[model samples]
Target: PTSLTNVTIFSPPSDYIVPRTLYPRNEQLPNGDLLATWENYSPEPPAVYFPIYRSKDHGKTWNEISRVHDTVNGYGLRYQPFLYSLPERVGSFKKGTLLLAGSSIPTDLSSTDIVLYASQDDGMTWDFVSHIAAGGEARPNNGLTPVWEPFLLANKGKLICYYSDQRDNATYGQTMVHQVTNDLKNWGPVVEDVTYPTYTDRPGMPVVTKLPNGQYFYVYEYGSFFGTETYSFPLYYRLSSDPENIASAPGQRLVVSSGTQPTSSPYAVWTPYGGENGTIIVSSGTQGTLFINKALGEGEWTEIPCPEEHGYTRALRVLSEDGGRYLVVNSAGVLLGENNRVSVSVMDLKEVL
Candidate 1:
């Protein structure tokens, strides 16, 4: 079996860098080059910037491509940055293009705007696409009602943007919504992706993957346990044959670890299984223990020992899978305490399986 190893890809250039999502998000080019991006946060509001890095030899070493964009005035970029590629030609962009999506938030946390960017020449440059969703408002209790964590999937000649929304609290605490687009200029109407109508719960951090068996799996984090539920913020998923309307599909609940707070940042990726269907790996935790699920929401989950305690907000990317030796890129960081630096780690597929 392949053993797992933890390696740091990059750390904060200064101590002022704090509360960063450290998405360490990545995309693989046709020529094998790896392009990655992370939300580099700062203690100063609206001064935040997103860092783009490139690694030619896997995740061994990474070079800073540029600090592409920053927040305006008192608003900063919030949550994670999702990086994806277009398998086929869409709109004006050619096939094998790269696109990025993330949430932009204000200092008061009153509202949020989900923005999109497209990169043609790999990670060399990027252009603003359009705001997928906007006009988010703050809650009555002085809490910001924001749309967080944008995840993208290309299907049926249209690009689907899935994100967590907090627009309607009377029905569901926090619901997941999705919008579809083709050329990135125009977007379709918003559709409910996931929500609990009977209970006071919050479903956030939507991550979707297409299984080899031509099935689509939507994974996310749900908090505020209802009724007899004990664990807090357990991971849940839904399956869909059609990508456009995944929220209406059926799903199951998965408890990976024990905790009182929501899992917050849960990430899911698929691995080779039998023929078409494959295994699923999900990771989430607080500022202490790191939890990982190897099963496809069927078997029990295992805990992956953290290299450093107080580490959270992990962004996982699969580098390659040759001979069943999976190389994963873990971009994570500690939001609080002394070791609060966004770092990268490498793990073997054997440890997860």
Candidate 2:
């Protein structure tokens, strides 16, 4: 474990107040600025809006306010929104673009809603795309279904959006399914039951990403709630060659090491392993264990030592830019106290890699 400084990217000043989570960290803007977004906390008012934050000088100081998501009807919904950026020169994007996906949840945890937002001029303004699948699939006994953690990626000139879906199915034999698309809207069928069960059937949180070498990784929680031992070793995952739909036959691949076999207990980070400038950072647990895996070997994951202390980590993105390097947050993705706040940290990429 090395010494890494974890600090609050946004604390409740006088105007903003209380427990904020899902701190999806920053990215370098087209004009050499940093753009970030997080769930705003207004405890007394119960007003949760996805607010934007920016930093110009490599994250030391931020101009912490903008508009990425517009809250609706004071509904107390919309949580865990993630943003994607494209450089200005790409096609119709003259000043780059941002894509965001978040869920609107009701009092019951199962009553979840989906909203996709987009921004043309950084995080200054945002517009809503149609809801993907709110609450559940529009089919029989799709009853009480829920979706969370939308993983968006631009693969081979297509925008592939993935959500962690939990709807019980018998034919494919498990509960996890991946819904995806070429365009952000107009999606195809659900890739049912991503991973087969070992003993009893259980699966969740399907976080997927495409690697630099063109391979895809589809990681999800694989286990059932049985005992304390099961709680100790809660979740593990598998991968895919084609991330479009992991359950399909075209390009599917699983981790050579299966189940909770590689890592230890007390694991819970809600994002998949992603690489930038030849470096990979991975976090998987509630206990904040972030790993640095470089692009090496004949496709092997060489685990670097864990950082000494953790202040809850998720949405782990490695940003390697001309000025400096940093890791951004997605959402703290925790269910604990002060569970939702943006904790940002600057990093020494060379040392970590």
Candidate 3:
């Protein structure tokens, strides 16, 4: 199952060098069109934009559709581009309206903005929606403030923007917080989603999915836990009944039953493939193998081989299924800027299982 990487979603020219891509985000539309976006960044020129793509032939091929730019901040769509299809309408938008959220930071890196953009033509074109949150600067270190990694989810006709907030660096080193919006114009107060009392314990990069049982499963990276020098960031999770109450939920370290620990840049999705409870597949940056749990988080997380090369926060989707047969893995290759072209692969669980 390892030689299945044959498609490139987006990439540089064959013989010329191009901007490095990072932190890929994607969403599958209600009409089967696959949308993918990534941080198109260049350090020497100091620029970033999220280029969106569409896949119509069942993940076999993809083509560039449109690009999301910084219309408000003028700093460009700096990093962490998440593409989400609205599950239901809340404001003037329809249920299928497409939303793209990105981190906009200036060249000096003096400020950070999590901005939102909406598309009506299935990501063909986009217009400014609103700023989700703003903070001091862009840095992961404690005592330095910056907000990062926006995950968009529609909950009970309202939109929830979950992100890693470091503005509270003095209080908890770093914490996960979110805000809600009903009309997409104004957001509610900043609500804590995941934060520990330990000042040095950094929790970030959250991904949430709902199970068939109706409970919400949230996963993120805990930076200061086991294998500090080696692991760098071990993945953890929290289960809650309400997406708004995920902050009050306790976190559990994500360790597979076979002792494999998935770390850094984690993303997760639930599929009704395994059984009645379905299967939750989680991917990590440090390993080519993915963590799958049939009983959600209550049971063991088994390790399964990944077809494509492991990537920094590689995104996954449930492509198609007869008996849980198909999966989509999109990655920007590995090792940051060295030959990091965004590639995608379709995997069959029948062979891996």
Predicted candidate 2 versus true structure: per-residue lDDT over 248-307, tens digit per residue: 532222222222233221122212223443544555554344544344212444444443
RMSD of 3: 2.6
Which residue runs of candidate 1 sit more than 4 Å off their true CA positions?
1-4, 14-17, 43-46, 70-76, 137-144, 228-231, 255-262, 273-276, 287-296, 299-310, 321-324, 350-352
Candidate 3 to truth, TM? 0.93
lDDT of 1 by residue, 1-353 (tens): 13334555566656554544455566767766777667666676445556677867766677888655633323655556788888777788778788878766665556777888777888678777788886465332213366777888888678889988777755667888999988877999989978776446777788887766677778787775567556367667888878777767765775545532336667767767322344665666453334444444554455555443334446655555463355454655654434444455555655544
Worst 10 residues of 3 by lDDT: 12-21
The residue-by-residue lDDT of candidate 3 on 1-353, one tens digit each, is 22246488888554423337777788888877788888776543435678888888767788989888787867878778898889899888899999998889887788889999999999989999999999887877779889999999998889999999999877887888899999888999999988887678888998998888888988899877453444368898999988899867788888789898678989998888777787899999889888888886886799987777888898988764454467888887665466778888877765654
Question: For model 1, where is the 10-residue window of minimal lDDT?
Answer: 135-144
Reference-based lDDT, each prediction: 0.65, 0.50, 0.82
Q: CA RMSD for every model?
A: 3.8, 5.9, 2.6
TM-score of each: 0.84, 0.73, 0.93
Better of 1 and 2 by lDDT: 1
Native-to-model Cα distance after best TM-score fit, residue 55 in candidate 3, in Å? 1.2
TM-score of 1: 0.84
The alpha-carbon deviation from the true structure for residue 190 of candidate 1, after best TM-score superposition, in angstroms, is 0.5
**Higher-ranked by lDDT: 2 or 3:** 3
